[PDB]
Amino acid sequence: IDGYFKIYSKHTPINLVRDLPQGFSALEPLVDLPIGINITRFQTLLAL
Amino acid sequence: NNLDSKVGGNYNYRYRLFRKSNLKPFERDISTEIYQAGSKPCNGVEGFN
Numbered sequence: 001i002d003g004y005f006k007i008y009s010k011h012t013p014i015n016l017v018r019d020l021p022q023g024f025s026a027l028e029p030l031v032d033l034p035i036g037i038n039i040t041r042f043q044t045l046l047a048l
Numbered sequence: 049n050n051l052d053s054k055v056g057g058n059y060n061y062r063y064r065l066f067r068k069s070n071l072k073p074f075e076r077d078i079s080t081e082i083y084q085a086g087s088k089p090c091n092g093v094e095g096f097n
């Protein structure tokens with residue numbers, strides 16, 4: 001937002017089958033950074 | 049002036065003179081590229097309008 005950057009997150013255990021779960025849970029803020037750049041795209045990074 | 053100014057003029061200081069529109073609040077623009085003032089596009093280093 002307008003010269004600011006933020007993260008929020010949560011983690012939980014569930015035993016479903018193959019999809020995102022039928023319940024309610026909420027994210028706390030983690031970190032904030034004054035990055036101030038145009039941002040238009042993103043990509044996730046995963047190991048082998 | 050008693051720090052910055054030079055008898056030839058201190059041209060190490062510059063500003064933006066041409067832009068498509070007014071920039072955003074606390075939004076800076078680091079561009080050197082040629083501005084097109086004419087209806088004609090402009091390509092390469094210089095041209096009319």
Ligand SMILES: *[C@@H]1O[C@H](CO)[C@@H](O[C@@H]2O[C@H](CO)[C@@H](O)[C@H](O)[C@H]2NC(C)=O)[C@H](O)[C@H]1NC(C)=O
Pocket residue numbers: 038039040072075
């Ligand atoms: C941040 O960058 C984007 C992309 O370079 C800018 O949006 C572009 O603006 C020009 C001029 O209107 C258009 O020709 C492009 O098609 C736009 N592209 C996209 C992806 O939107 C945007 O204006 C920039 N933001 C700031 C504040 O400078």
